[PDB]
Structure formats: C-alpha cells, structure tokens
Scaffold this active site. Structure first.
Site, PDB file in Angstrom:
ATOM      1  N   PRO A 125       0.821  -1.215   0.000  1.00 27.46           N
ATOM      2  CA  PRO A 125       0.000   0.000   0.000  1.00 27.46           C
ATOM      3  C   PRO A 125       0.852   1.260   0.000  1.00 27.46           C
ATOM      4  O   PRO A 125       1.996   1.270   0.460  1.00 27.46           O
ATOM      5  CB  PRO A 125      -0.807  -0.119   1.297  1.00 27.46           C
ATOM      6  CG  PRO A 125       0.053  -0.945   2.187  1.00 27.46           C
ATOM      7  CD  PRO A 125       0.736  -1.935   1.285  1.00 27.46           C
ATOM      8  N   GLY A 145       1.142   3.986  -4.883  1.00 31.95           N
ATOM      9  CA  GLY A 145       0.556   4.766  -5.953  1.00 31.95           C
ATOM     10  C   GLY A 145       0.134   3.995  -7.181  1.00 31.95           C
ATOM     11  O   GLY A 145       0.259   4.517  -8.292  1.00 31.95           O
ATOM     12  N   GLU A 153      23.349  -1.045  25.561  1.00 31.87           N
ATOM     13  CA  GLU A 153      23.402  -0.430  24.238  1.00 31.87           C
ATOM     14  C   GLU A 153      24.809   0.053  23.904  1.00 31.87           C
ATOM     15  O   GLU A 153      25.281  -0.119  22.771  1.00 31.87           O
ATOM     16  CB  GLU A 153      22.405   0.725  24.153  1.00 31.87           C
ATOM     17  CG  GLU A 153      20.941   0.366  24.406  1.00 31.87           C
ATOM     18  CD  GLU A 153      20.562  -1.043  23.989  1.00 31.87           C
ATOM     19  OE1 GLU A 153      20.664  -1.371  22.790  1.00 31.87           O
ATOM     20  OE2 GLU A 153      20.136  -1.820  24.868  1.00 31.87           O
ATOM     21  N   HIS A 182      31.716  -1.282  16.788  1.00 33.52           N
ATOM     22  CA  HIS A 182      32.792  -0.390  16.372  1.00 33.52           C
ATOM     23  C   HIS A 182      34.155  -1.070  16.440  1.00 33.52           C
ATOM     24  O   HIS A 182      34.995  -0.849  15.563  1.00 33.52           O
ATOM     25  CB  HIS A 182      32.785   0.875  17.230  1.00 33.52           C
ATOM     26  CG  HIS A 182      31.988   1.998  16.643  1.00 33.52           C
ATOM     27  ND1 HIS A 182      32.411   3.310  16.679  1.00 33.52           N
ATOM     28  CD2 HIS A 182      30.795   2.006  16.003  1.00 33.52           C
ATOM     29  CE1 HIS A 182      31.513   4.076  16.088  1.00 33.52           C
ATOM     30  NE2 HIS A 182      30.523   3.309  15.668  1.00 33.52           N
ATOM     31  N   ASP A 203      16.815 -10.464  25.156  1.00 36.69           N
ATOM     32  CA  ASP A 203      16.385 -10.596  23.766  1.00 36.69           C
ATOM     33  C   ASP A 203      17.568 -10.832  22.835  1.00 36.69           C
ATOM     34  O   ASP A 203      17.487 -11.650  21.909  1.00 36.69           O
ATOM     35  CB  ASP A 203      15.609  -9.351  23.339  1.00 36.69           C
ATOM     36  CG  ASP A 203      14.366  -9.124  24.176  1.00 36.69           C
ATOM     37  OD1 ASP A 203      14.176  -9.854  25.172  1.00 36.69           O
ATOM     38  OD2 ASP A 203      13.578  -8.216  23.837  1.00 36.69           O
TER      39      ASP A 203
END
Lengths: 308, 498, 48, 45
Positions: B56, B59, B276, B284, B358
């Site tokens: 969806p 267009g 995090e 990194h 998780d």
C-alpha cells in the site's frame, strides 16, 4: 433524531466543580490551555492573526482524575456553550452509514452555534485503531473515521468550534487522528504533586469537613497516604476520614437511627435564626457530650496511620 | 454509481517515480490506448486485464490515473469495497452498468481499487458471500466475453495476491500481472523531489541521505514525511523546512515521539545504557580491528520514545552484501549480538539483568540457524528445526535481516526421527555460543576505559553519536588504566563538538 | 441465624429500612457540629 | 426503523411507570444478557 436530542442538553457552564485555578497537573501545560480558551472566547482574534488555531485538543489520563471536571473548567473559563455527546448516539448500529450523517448534523448544528465545544467521553471505545475489529464492524467504523477526519480538515474555516475527546491511553487512538491540524493539542494528566495534593486536601477539609477539626489533622501525612489518588477523591477524602474516625469508638445503630429520624423530622420546621441562636449552639455540644461522640486528635491520627 | 468522467485526470507519467519497470511495461498499454490502429493491422490480442499487485501507498491508483491522463481517455474509478452490499444482485448490476458505460466511450479504462474485496478466495481453513460470488461470476463473464478489438482495458489493483482467486489469474481475463515494488534509493529520491516542490524548502536539507537511510518506505510514507515536517516547522514557527525539523519528523515516525520527564530510577537506566553502549562498542571494535562486514553505529539513546526505553541506531547496508552471508560475517554479527551481555558481565562483574535477554535469544537462534538450517559447519545434518519463537525484523535495534530475515526458515525443516543427534546438535550449539561468548567478553574486557567513558558520557548527555563513540575509542587506547578516566573532573563530559 | 452469622443481609435490611422511612431523600444536613457528627457516625454504622 | 421506536417507547414507559410507582424497588436479574438502546436508557437514567 439523536442529534437534536443531544443538542437539547445544551448547558452554559459558569461554575465548574474543580476550577482551573484549583486543578492540578496543568502548570506544565497551562499555556496551551490558555491558548485554547483564548481561541474559544474570541475565534475572530485567532482567525485574523493567520496562525493555525487548535481545532482539536485531546485529554489522556485515568478514570476519575477530574478530566470531565477539567473540560468543564476549560469551558467555564472560555465562557462558551457546551454539549455532552455520549458515545451511544454516534454508533447507531442499525444502518451502515448513519454515523457519518449523525456527526455531519452534529458539526452542522455546531457551526450554526459556534464557538461551541463537542465533548465526547470514552473516545477510544469507538474511534480506536483500524483492524482490531474483524466481524462486520470495519466498514461502518471506516466511514465514521473518514467522515470525522474530513470534518476536522475544514480548509481554513475556523468557525470557533472545537472538539475535546476523552480517552484513557494515547496508544489506542488511530494514527490518522494523531496528526496536527485535525487534533492539535495533547494534554496528559497522570497524578498531582505533593504540594498540590496538600492544597486540594486542605481545600476539601475547608469546604466539607468541620473547620474546628482541620488543624487536628496533619495533612502532610494524609497526602503521603493519598499519593495514588485523584482530585475528586481528594475532595471526598475528609468525610470518609471522619467516618473512619467515628469507627473507633463503641456505639449502637438504633440510637443513631432514632436521633437521625428525630432530626430529619424536626429540622424541616425549625427556623434558621433559632438554629443560629446560642441556645441551639450549646444544645448540640451537650447532645454530643451526653451521647459520647467527641472526635479527638489521636483518633484521627490512628485512623490515618491505620489506612494504606 | 458516480464514476467520475474526467477529461483530464490531472496527473501524468511525470508524477510517478520509482515505478520505472512497471511504467515501462505499461507503456505498451499507453501505446494501445492512444492509437490502436497499428496494433490492429498486425494482429495483436491485447491483454484483457492487467493486475497491479504491491504494497500500500505505492501509488498504483496514481499509476493508472497517470496512464489515463497521458492516454487522454476517460478514467472510471470505483473501489472493490463499493461492490459489497446487503441486497443480492445489486453488485452485479453495478458491474454491468460500469462495463457498459466503458463500452460507450471506447477506448476507456476500468479501474477497480482493492479488487480482493470482491475476489476473496474460498478459504477452507449471511447472504453477503453469495453476493460476492455472483459479482465475481458477472465480472468474469464480462471479462471473458470482452472482444479485444474494441480496446477497453480493465485495471485491477490489489494488495495481496494470495487471497485472489486463481480463476482471474487464468489467461484471457488477467493477461498481464505487474508488481509494484517499493521505490529504490533513486525512486525515493525522485518522490522526495516531487513532494518537496509543494512545500517551502531550505537549502540545508539534503534529501539524498533521507532517501538512502529510509529503506522500503512507500510514496505515501514519504508524503507523510514531508507533511509532518511541514507541521513540525509550523509548530516551531519556522519559515521553511530545516534539516532539524526533517530529522524530527524522521524520529517521530520511525521510533516515535519523545515523552516528557518519564524516567525510571538511576539503576533502571544504567543497565540499558551499559547494554546499548556495549553493543555499539563491540560493533565499532569489530569494524576497527578485523574489518567485519557489519553495520555502523549512527546514534545511541536512552530517552524513551514510543515503547522503547532506550535505542541504538544502526545503518542499513546495501542488499548485494545481504545474499552470500559467509560464516565469519555471521560470527561477527553474533558477537555483536552478545555484546550487550558482555557489557553486563564486564561492568557489573557477575550480576547481569533482564535488559539483554532478547539479544541472547537472537544469538541462540542464529547459532541454530548456522548449525541446522544453513549447515555451514561440516558435519552433515539430516533436518532443520523451525524457530520456537518468532520476532519480526524491525527498527533501530540489531538488524537481524542480513539474509532477508532471521526468524524465517526457508521451509528447510523436517520432523526428526533419531533423538540421539539432537543432543549432539545442542552440544555443538552450546560450544559455539560459549566459545563466542568468551571471545566477545575477552575483547570487550580489554577496553574497560572506553566502555566506561562512553557509558558515563551517554548517561550525562542522554544521547551519543557514532562519531563521539569513535572519538572516545581513539582517545582511549587499549590497556590504559581506569584511573585515567577516574581522575577526570567530569567523566561524562564530551570535549568534541560535531 | 444469629447476628454475626450473616452481615450482608443486615446491610440489605438496613438499606431497605432506610428506604422505607424516606430517609434517603434527605441526603445531608450541613449543620453546625452536632447533626453532622451524628450523620457521620450513622454512615459509619451503616456499612461496617 | 420500527424496532428502535417500539423498544424506546417500551423502555421509557417502563421507567415512567417505575417513577409513577414511587417509592418502589426495581429488580433487574441477569444483566449479562445486555442492546444499545437499553444501555443508553440505563446510562441516562
């Protein structure tokens, strides 16, 4: 015709139950409320200045926080008429497409009386996210939400009419309603502060409970015992507190019932100046002393630290 | 049935973008529409129906409208949901009326949006269903009875190919099937150029980065991007769209709006920050030292947005490297997944928490996928196993879509018979996970100064950038004492200005 | 069926008794000190 | 549109009769059977 029946309940609110000056948890968001009530009082001022006036403000919070009283206080400060439209008349579940006509006539009559406010409670019950309902309740809700969006998207027509919808959580509402220009402002009310809890508690003790008994209660610790509570419950605390204070002593039901019956029969006739006469003032205290219903400090302190 | 008879639809082929293959295929339809004579002289049977299938907001309706506008033919639009009623037979009558009105002004185009509403498959997993079948029968009768010499092309737009009946997919009714893929980087670039001409734009906005960094976003989603950017600029009373407001719209629609003062305790934020920052530091370091084929950190945040109490942002790489996932690439991505638990184990010593569970589950499942599904190691295995838990690929959290997705077996599973090799597979997975855990904890424990400084700086600023993490890594070489960080006047201070 | 055997039926009996003597339309007194204290004690005794 | 009018007249006649019989006790067994019109009547009552 549910639209005309709903508009027949028109009210001009002048005295709110809890005014905005007394209402809590609004100081971090008071400027938006002031902008909204300035738009409501003088829609021409917002129309002439060219900025996008707030077409919709949404209140989110818990059941009983004074959110209907917050809307009433906003209306009273704005001094504009209001209509209480329930959720039942919108979802006329008999013909597919009657909700669009219902809200179309609602907005039409609102425009003829503008500036007015559409106050709808439990807004997430009928206008939630799309797709949660599977069996037959998708097309009518789709027509309802599309009609509501295109009515809230009036192309630069600021008649002064505003819609305050009330929900419980901000996630249950559809994303299409979350965009600004249809529903501009969001007002989150979760819990008051300690000083504001103390102020509302003292106002409740000053307007409901005995003015002689207000100093005997240290309201700071009562506020620390009512942290999870709400302003209307902050108003109804003192009489329940006095009842629990009277709970401590030993007393009988039928004597109280007889005294209540005698006073209910006899207070209908006694004159006011005979009540304000010093004889009636000193008669009640001897009645309390003889019956034994003296309410003391330590009673109420034991009551407040007995609660949770 | 107010089928809008518009002489000019208002949109042309210059208004569509990112649909280059489909519009190139439909150029044949446009050529048939503007002059069918050279088609008729050589003897082509034109396609009876063309089915536009896609996500969806891409267009497809706009594509058909542009086809009609360039062809200069009337466009008949009435959606599939307009064919559903309560009374029986009215929908077939509307089908007949629309078809005959199309046959009045030949050539003409018939377009049915959401055709799967009337064409739901008779799934074997009221009288409205009979109405749907009668409308389907009438539509297929009108399609099959259509002579191809009169040039009435019927267009069908659908969002799901599975629920559509195979009878229409039979040749003679829907001869052409076009997929409308989500726009690529150049397609989203061109859609941004088109939509940015309607609103005031500043020169500081670089739309190439926004087109590259928003993968798979539909044209309507770019439209809501620019609209919410305009509304944010209105909220800020900006005279034009700045880059800050555009990024504000990005973080509003991707992760969600920022809350006001909703924070947990100082311990409830240190653990998420540590997790995090450890994941970012592992990513990194793997980029810096071994030159892994993994992503790059953009920014790390602990400000609650939407329903995420903290977030680390990772760039999405090019899909050409997302097909032949080798063993080393998977091992480094799996080390990146346990980077969070490595951070909890090195910073807190031995008291880990539930904030990195998780990532542990993702690592445990991708170890099984390496072992059983892909059979990357070289003892041969007889069966693969489906994931007991399924988490969808999603936003800023770790990509987990390097092979299209993580929790999607490619129907490579069979029920096992021997139960003695299942334990050897489990032991192999445990050995791989344990060895990889010791390697990631050993590599992260060698740099405690950079990790601790990044945690402190991110805790003070509530948000850090990838360049700031790189600066901390450069200014804190490996094997430097923690007292060097601890002697600073402000550990959570960033002297680098972006 | 002594007193302490059932508390709920006693409460329902008191409610219907108050309904019988029209003791509900007179919802409150808002008087000086005495009738208010009596009413608070009565409202305590009604429920608990 | 005939069922709604009949039901509304019926329920408002019940409520007007209950008011006319004041004082009275109204007993409503098995609320779980509850449909929108009766809900509206009860909430406005």
């Amino acid at each position: 015709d549910p639209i005309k029946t709903a508009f027949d309940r028109m009210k001009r609110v002048k005295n709110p139950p809890i005014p905005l000056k007394n209402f809590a948890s609004i100081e971090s968001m008071r400027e938006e409320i002031n902008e909204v009530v300035a738009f409501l009082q003088n829609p021409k001022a917002f129309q002439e200045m060219g900025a996008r006036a707030p077409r919709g403000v949404l209140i989110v919070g818990e059941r009983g926080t004074g959110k209907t009283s917050l809307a009433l206080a906003i209306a009273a400060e704005a001094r504009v008429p209001v209509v209480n439209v329930e959720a039942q008349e919108l979802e006329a579940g008999l013909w597919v497409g009657q909700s669009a006509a219902n809200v179309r006539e609602l907005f039409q009559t609102a425009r003829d009386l503008a500036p007015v406010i559409i106050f709808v409670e439990d807004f997430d019950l009928f206008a939630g996210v799309r797709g949660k309902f599977v069996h037959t309740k998708q097309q009518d809700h789709e027509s309802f939400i599309n009609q509501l969006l295109v009515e809230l998207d009036g192309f630069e027509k600021q008649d002064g009419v505003v819609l305050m919808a009330t929900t419980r959580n901000h996630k249950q509402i559809d994303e299409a309603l979350r965009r600004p220009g249809r529903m501009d402002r969001v007002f989150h009310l979760q819990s008051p502060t300690e000083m504001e809890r103390e102020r509302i508690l003292h106002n409740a003790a000053e307007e409901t409970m005995d003015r002689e008994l207000v100093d005997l209660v240290d309201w700071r610790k009562v506020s620390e015992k009512t942290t999870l509570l709400r302003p209307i419950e902050l108003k109804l605390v003192p009489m329940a507190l006095e009842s629990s204070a009277f709970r401590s002593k030993f007393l009988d039901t039928d004597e109280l019932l007889s005294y209540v019956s005698w006073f209910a029969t006899f207070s209908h006739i006694v004159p006011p100046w005979l009540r304000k006469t010093k004889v009636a003032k000193t008669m009640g205290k001897m009645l309390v002393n003889h019956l034994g219903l003296n309410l003391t400090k330590d009673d109420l302190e034991n009551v407040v630290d007995l609660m949770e | 049935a107010e089928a809008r008879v518009d002489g000019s639809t208002g949109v042309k082929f210059a208004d569509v973008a990112g649909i280059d293959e489909a519009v190139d295929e439909l150029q044949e339809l446009v050529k048939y529409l503007k002059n069918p004579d050279l088609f008729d002289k050589m003897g082509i049977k034109p396609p009876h129906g063309v089915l536009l299938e896609g996500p969806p907001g891409c267009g497809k309706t706009l594509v058909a409208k542009a086809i009609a506008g360039e062809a200069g033919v009337p466009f008949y639009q009435m959606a599939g949901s307009e064919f559903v009623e309560v009374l029986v037979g009215v929908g077939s009558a509307r089908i007949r009326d629309l078809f005959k009105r199309a046959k009045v002004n030949k050539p003409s185009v018939i377009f049915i949006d959401e055709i799967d509403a009337l064409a739901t498959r008779r799934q074997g997993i009221n009288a409205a269903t009979q109405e749907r079948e009668t409308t389907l029968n009438q539509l297929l009768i009108e399609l099959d009875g259509f002579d191809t010499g009169k040039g009435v092309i019927f267009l069908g737009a659908t969002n799901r190919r599975d629920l559509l009946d195979p009878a229409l997919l039979r040749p003679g009714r829907f001869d052409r099937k076009i997929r409308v893929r989500p726009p690529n980087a150049k397609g989203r670039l061109d859609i941004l150029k088109i939509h940015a001409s309607k609103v005031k734009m500043s020169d500081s906005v670089d739309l190439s980065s926004y087109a590259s960094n928003l993968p798979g976003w539909s044209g309507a989603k770019l439209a809501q991007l620019v609209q919410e950017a305009a509304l944010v600029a209105v909220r800020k009373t900006h005279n034009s769209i700045l880059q800050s407001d555009m990024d504000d719209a990005v973080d509003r629609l991707t992760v969600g709006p920022t809350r006001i003062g909703l924070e947990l305790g100082h311990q409830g934020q240190c653990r998420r920050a540590t997790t995090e920052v450890g994941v970012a530091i592992t990513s990194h370091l793997l980029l810096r030292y071994e030159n892994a084929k993994i992503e790059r950190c953009d920014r790390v945040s602990i400000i609650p947005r939407g329903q995420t109490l903290s977030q680390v942002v990772f760039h999405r790489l090019d899909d050409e490297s997302y097909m032949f996932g080798r063993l080393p690439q998977l091992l480094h991505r799996l080390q990146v997944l346990l980077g969070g638990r490595a951070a909890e184990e090195v910073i807190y010593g031995s008291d880990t928490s539930k904030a990195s569970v998780d990532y542990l589950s993702d690592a445990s499942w991708l170890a099984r996928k390496i072992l059983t599904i892909w059979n990357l190691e070289n003892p041969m295995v007889i069966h693969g196993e489906p994931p007991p838990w399924r988490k969808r690929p999603q936003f800023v959290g770790p990509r987990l879509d390097f092979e299209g997705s993580l929790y999607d077996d490619y129907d490579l599973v069979e029920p096992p018979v021997n139960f003695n090799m299942d334990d050897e597979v489990a032991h192999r997975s445990e050995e791989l996970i344990s060895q990889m855990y010791n390697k990631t904890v050993s590599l992260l424990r060698q740099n405690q100064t950079a990790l601790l400084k990044t945690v402190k700086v991110l805790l003070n600023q509530k948000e850090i950038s990838g360049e700031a993490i790189d600066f901390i890594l450069d200014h804190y070489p490996p094997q430097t004492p923690l007292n060097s960080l601890l002697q600073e006047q402000n550990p959570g201070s960033l002297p680098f200005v972006p | 069926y002594q007193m302490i055997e059932q508390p709920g039926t006693i409460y329902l009996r008191y409610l219907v008794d108050i309904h019988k003597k029209y003791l509900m339309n007179y919802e409150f007194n808002t008087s000086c000190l005495a009738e208010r204290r009596i009413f608070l004690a009565h409202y305590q005794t009604i429920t608990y | 549109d005939m069922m709604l009018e009949i039901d509304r007249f019926y329920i408002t006649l019940q409520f007007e009769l209950a008011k006319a019989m004041s004082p009275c006790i109204i007993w409503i067994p098995n609320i779980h059977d509850l449909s929108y019109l009766a809900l509206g009547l009860l909430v406005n009552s």
